[PDB]
Amino acid sequence: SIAQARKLVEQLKMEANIDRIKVSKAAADLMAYCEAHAKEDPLLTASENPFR
Amino acid sequence: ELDQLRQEAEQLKNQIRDARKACADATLSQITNNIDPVGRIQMRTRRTLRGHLAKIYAMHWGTDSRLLVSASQDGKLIIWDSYTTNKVHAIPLRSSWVMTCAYAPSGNYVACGGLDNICSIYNLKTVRVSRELAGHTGYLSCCRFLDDNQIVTSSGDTTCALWDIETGQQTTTFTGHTGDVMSLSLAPDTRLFVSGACDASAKLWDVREGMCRQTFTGHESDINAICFFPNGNAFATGSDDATCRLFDLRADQELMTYSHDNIICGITSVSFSKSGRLLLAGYDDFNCNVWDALKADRAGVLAGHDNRVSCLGVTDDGMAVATGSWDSFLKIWN
Amino acid sequence: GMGIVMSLIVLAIVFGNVLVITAIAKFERLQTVTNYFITSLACADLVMGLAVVPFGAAHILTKTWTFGNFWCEFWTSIDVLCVTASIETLCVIAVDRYFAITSPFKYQSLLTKNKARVIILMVWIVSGLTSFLPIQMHWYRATHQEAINCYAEETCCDFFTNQAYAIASSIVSFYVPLVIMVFVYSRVFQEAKRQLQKIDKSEGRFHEHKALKTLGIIMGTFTLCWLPFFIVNIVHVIQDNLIRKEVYILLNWIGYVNSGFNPLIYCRSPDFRIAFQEL
Amino acid sequence: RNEEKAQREANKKIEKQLQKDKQVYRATHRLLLLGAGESGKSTIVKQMRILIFETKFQVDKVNFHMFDVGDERRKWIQCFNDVTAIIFVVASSSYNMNRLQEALNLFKSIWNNRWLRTISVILFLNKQDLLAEKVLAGKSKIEDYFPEFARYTTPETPEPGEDPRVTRAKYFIRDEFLRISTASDGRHYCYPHFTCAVDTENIRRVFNDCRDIIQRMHLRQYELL
Ligand SMILES: Nc1nc2c(ncn2[C@@H]2O[C@H](COP(=O)(O)OP(=O)(O)OP(=O)(O)O)[C@@H](O)[C@H]2O)c(=O)[nH]1
Numbered sequence: 001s002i003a004q005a006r007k008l009v010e011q012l013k014m015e016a017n018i019d020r021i022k023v024s025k026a027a028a029d030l031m032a033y034c035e036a037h038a039k040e041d042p043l044l045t046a047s048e049n050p051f052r
Numbered sequence: 053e054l055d056q057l058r059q060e061a062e063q064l065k066n067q068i069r070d071a072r073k074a075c076a077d078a079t080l081s082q083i084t085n086n087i088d089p090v091g092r093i094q095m096r097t098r099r100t101l102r103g104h105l106a107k108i109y110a111m112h113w114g115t116d117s118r119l120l121v122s123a124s125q126d127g128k129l130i131i132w133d134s135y136t137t138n139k140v141h142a143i144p145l146r147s148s149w150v151m152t153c154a155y156a157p158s159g160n161y162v163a164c165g166g167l168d169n170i171c172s173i174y175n176l177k178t179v180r181v182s183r184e185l186a187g188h189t190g191y192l193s194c195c196r197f198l199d200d201n202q203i204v205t206s207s208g209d210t211t212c213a214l215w216d217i218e219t220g221q222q223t224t225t226f227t228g229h230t231g232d233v234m235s236l237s238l239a240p241d242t243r244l245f246v247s248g249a250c251d252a253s254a255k256l257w258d259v260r261e262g263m264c265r266q267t268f269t270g271h272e273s274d275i276n277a278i279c280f281f282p283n284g285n286a287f288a289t290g291s292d293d294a295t296c297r298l299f300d301l302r303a304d305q306e307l308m309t310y311s312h313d314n315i316i317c318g319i320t321s322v323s324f325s326k327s328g329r330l331l332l333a334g335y336d337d338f339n340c341n342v343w344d345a346l347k348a349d350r351a352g353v354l355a356g357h358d359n360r361v362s363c364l365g366v367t368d369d370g371m372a373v374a375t376g377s378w379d380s381f382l383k384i385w386n
Numbered sequence: 387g388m389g390i391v392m393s394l395i396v397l398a399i400v401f402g403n404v405l406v407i408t409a410i411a412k413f414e415r416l417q418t419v420t421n422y423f424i425t426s427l428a429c430a431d432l433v434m435g436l437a438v439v440p441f442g443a444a445h446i447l448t449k450t451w452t453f454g455n456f457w458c459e460f461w462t463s464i465d466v467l468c469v470t471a472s473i474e475t476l477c478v479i480a481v482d483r484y485f486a487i488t489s490p491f492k493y494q495s496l497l498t499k500n501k502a503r504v505i506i507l508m509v510w511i512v513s514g515l516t517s518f519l520p521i522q523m524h525w526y527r528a529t530h531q532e533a534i535n536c537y538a539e540e541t542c543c544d545f546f547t548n549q550a551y552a553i554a555s556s557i558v559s560f561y562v563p564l565v566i567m568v569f570v571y572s573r574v575f576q577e578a579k580r581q582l583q584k585i586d587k588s589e590g591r592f593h594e595h596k597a598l599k600t601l602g603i604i605m606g607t608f609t610l611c612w613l614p615f616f617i618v619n620i621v622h623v624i625q626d627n628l629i630r631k632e633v634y635i636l637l638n639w640i641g642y643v644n645s646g647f648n649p650l651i652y653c654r655s656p657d658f659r660i661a662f663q664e665l
Numbered sequence: 666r667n668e669e670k671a672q673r674e675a676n677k678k679i680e681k682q683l684q685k686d687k688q689v690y691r692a693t694h695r696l697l698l699l700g701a702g703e704s705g706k707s708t709i710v711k712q713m714r715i716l717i718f719e720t721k722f723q724v725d726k727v728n729f730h731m732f733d734v735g736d737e738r739r740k741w742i743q744c745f746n747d748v749t750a751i752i753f754v755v756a757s758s759s760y761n762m763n764r765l766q767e768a769l770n771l772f773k774s775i776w777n778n779r780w781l782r783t784i785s786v787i788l789f790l791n792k793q794d795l796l797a798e799k800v801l802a803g804k805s806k807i808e809d810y811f812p813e814f815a816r817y818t819t820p821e822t823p824e825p826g827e828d829p830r831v832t833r834a835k836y837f838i839r840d841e842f843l844r845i846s847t848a849s850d851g852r853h854y855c856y857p858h859f860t861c862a863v864d865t866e867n868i869r870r871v872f873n874d875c876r877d878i879i880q881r882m883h884l885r886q887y888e889l890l
């Protein structure tokens with residue numbers, strides 16, 4: 001399967017060339033999102049329960 | 053020439069690892085250390101659904117947060133009503149083996165597939181078979197309605213395809229996996245989707261382009277379930293090693309692992325909450341557990357099932373969570 | 387002295403029965419068509435232990451009945467009903483086991499959750515027909531001087547019975563549900579012995595007391611508990627001045643002891659062990 | 666207010682249908698047919714067709730249902746943990762074409778599966794006449810392929826007319842499977858058989874064993890065996 005190897009070789013180069021950022025920024029964004037949308041989670045935090 | 057080409061790929065595989073390690077500025081545990089814990093969480097069952105003759109393999113909440121569908125080995129699809137715990141429909145199946153089900157966003161179609169290499173689509177508001185999709189050479193594992201006219205599904209022949217309901221012919225085929233494909237999830241904008249194969253690897257696909265973009269290989273065993281973060285830039289996977297890992301699309305690398313020394317059982321379902329703070333995961337220990345997304349601290353146990361849990365889902369409005377077990381029982385937690 | 391023993395017996399009778407009853411209700415898995423007979427037996431045994439044992443112990447301790455004649459007649463009727471209903475349930479269980487073992491392909495069709503309720507109602511009605519109708523009415527009344535003398539007095543009411551009732555009640559309660567048990571268990575033992583021989587011939591080159599132990603325990607406990615009483619019952623009525631009253635009371639009380647052994651025999655499954663530990 | 670009444674009526678109809686279907690679901694028995702390649706399962710089934718691909722057959726007013734197995738590793742086998750029995754078909758005469766060793770490995774893998782702990786196996790040893798033809802006046806010998814055949818002796822029910830050699834070969838082949846079946850429980854057993862593809866008596870072979878399996882399960886349930 002020389003061809004199978006060729007297909008594998010091309011994909012890695014495409015995977016290799018991409019733009020990436022530091023994990024600190026992503027962690028900060030996730031924490032900010034969780035903090036901002038933490039006031040609208042009925043499971044996490046009693047106006048009505050439809051099941052009541 | 054195959055050997056030398058394989059060696060070049062190994063050098064490329066190395067080139068990435070170095071790039072991935074270069075961006076590891078700080079672990080997520082270090083960043084989130086002073087965050088106050090969510091505290092103990094207690095949940096009690098509110099409804100119990102009876103009427104299924106055999107074990108339950110899959111379910112899918114409706115878009116209105118009221119109706120849901122379930123599948124069992126008896127060859128019957130039942131559409132429930134959570135508010136009044138009464139049944140609405142009962143659809144017999146030609147094949148007695150089923151492994152997945154789905155509910156349309158418009159609330160008009162319900163699809164299911166199983167051991168037979170056929171995906172069947174039913175028309176709720178007309179109940180008879182509307183179309184049958186064929187072409188897969190392996191058993192189906194999951195299927196999600198991308199829209200009201202096209203469906204994306206994954207089979208056991210290491211391929212994923214996008215179908216057209218009106219025509220009945222494949223549009224795009226995704227290849228690259230080595231082991232069987234077990235589950236998938238869709239992004240909110242229906243532009244990208246991820247899949248978890250049996251070769252301990254999850255990939256990110258492009259629906260329009262039809263070509264793979266990224267690959268993650270943190271796990272070392274089979275992957276049974278996958279979920280997707282509400283923000284749209286993260287996802288979590290569950291494997292047979294009692295470990296849950298939260299990956300990231302932009303950084304391209306793992307950010308935390310969820311594991312405990314007292315569990316050696318596999319994981320069958322993973323789902324998020326509305327805010328993404330809680331990561332609910334199912335186990336083979338006849339119960340369920342609740343993790344913390346940003347602290348990896350257990351904060352609740354959801355027990356009450358006499359057999360293994362195989363289904364899990366959270367409503368769009370985040371009002372309740374439902375579990376399916378092999379004991380032919382459905383429960384509603386809140 | 388004997389009060390402590392009576393209290394311990396009452397506690398042992400009550401605790402096991404209530405524990406068994408609570409467990410079946412608590413767990414859906416425990417509930418089964420074959421478990422309806424067990425819980426019916428547990429309910430009957432609980433009623434017997436909470437009705438006849440304490441009053442009988444009090445009467446034998448104080449040696450003087452301090453209640454009315456109607457109350458002790460009702461007590462006797464309740465005792466007869468419970469004793470009669472505590473054996474036919476065992477017979478029904480044996481028949482169910484026979485059908486399950488010797489008819490594997492037709493077990494599901496023959497037994498249904500709807501038929502179990504019908505059988506339980508029928509057996510309870512049969513037990514109550516011979517325990518309330520002939521005793522609330524005066525068909526069982528004797529004729530000799532001592533019997534009527536005690537009947538007239540409001541302080542004594544002992545069991546004096548005539549030949550017809552003493553024979554009919556014994557035949558209905560004990561002797562009939564015994565031959566069925568013998569035949570059923572003989573057939574089950576034969577089938578078990580046959581199945582074991584086939585395994586030995588196939589795997590003998592590479593490589594039966596359990597059935598005897600189980601059948602021996604099951605038959606022996608019941609036979610030893612309830613055999614002598616239902617013999618002296620006929621004996622002292624055929625001929626008088628042969629069986630002392632104290633011997634009769636002692637044998638009857640020994641028969642009551644069988645109450646505390648049914649949970650220890652018919653609830654030994656691992657599922658019951660898992661259920662009991664949780665509660 | 667009529668919506669609640671309509672929903673209740675629909676629920677009552679659905680429960681009535683489910684109660685009707687419960688009896689027919691409980692009556693039938695499910696079997697799984699699983700055999701290696703070139704074994705001859707097609708000859709066994711269609712010849713027994715007179716009465717995934719599914720077949721329904723009836724024996725003495727008993728409903729039987731059988732499923733075939735339409736690769737290297739099986740993850741779909743988890744769904745078959747509630748079947749009554751598993752039918753295994755292997756070619757006995759293919760000891761030199763090794764295929765027999767692969768069949769032994771497959772049987773060992775199936776026996777020790779986590780989800781098939783309490784599932785019995787019915788063994789059909791197919792192609793009986795080809796094995797006899799090979800062994801009689803045959804240059805090929807089992808000794809070269811199987812070294813353990815040298816120190817094997819005949820176990821003291823032969824049909825008439827068969828040379829000691831065919832009996833020794835058949836019983837050696839059966840023992841190679843019985844060893845794997847026996848050492849690893851008493852919760853489940855194996856039922857060896859000798860069946861030519863044309864055999865018309867194979868249908869009764871299943872019914873008799875299913876009955877034995879159910880009887881043994883019931884006996885072990887009440888702690889009598
Ligand atoms: N003499 C003899 N020939 C047999 C026997 N079983 C099968 N054959 C022959 O060998 C052929 C191969 O078996 P088939 O029934 O075609 O099935 P298969 O080729 O094994 O294919 P699968 O069933 O899918 O494994 C048959 O069609 C017969 O001609 C047997 O027991 N004896």
Ligand SMILES: CN[C@@H]1CCc2c(ccc(O)c2O)[C@H]1O
Pocket residue numbers: 462465466469470545552555556559619638
């Ligand atoms: C008061 N004790 C009674 C007296 C006679 C009797 C008993 C039980 C079953 C019968 O068939 C009887 O005739 C005893 O429990």
